[PDB]
């Protein structure tokens, strides 16, 4: 009755569909955080070496 296992190699349950997209859902959650977080990333201008480097005033 080992054939069962041998047949498991020729069958991909929906579990692969959750293990396939699931991993991405994680990446999407990471991007979503950096997104709302990015907002605060604009609450500080690049006071790098000397300012100016512009034209208008």
From Swiss-Prot:
It comes from the Eukaryota. The chain crosses the membrane at residues 19-41. This is Insulin receptor subunit beta. It comes from Homo sapiens. The gene is INSR.
């Amino acid at each position: 009755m080992t054939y069962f296992y041998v047949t498991d190699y020729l069958d991909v349950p929906s579990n692969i569909a959750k293990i396939i997209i699931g991993p991405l859902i994680f990446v999407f959650l990471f991007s979503v955080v950096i997104g709302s977080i990015y907002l605060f990333l604009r609450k500080r201008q690049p006071d790098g070496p000397l300012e100016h480097h512009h034209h208008h005033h």
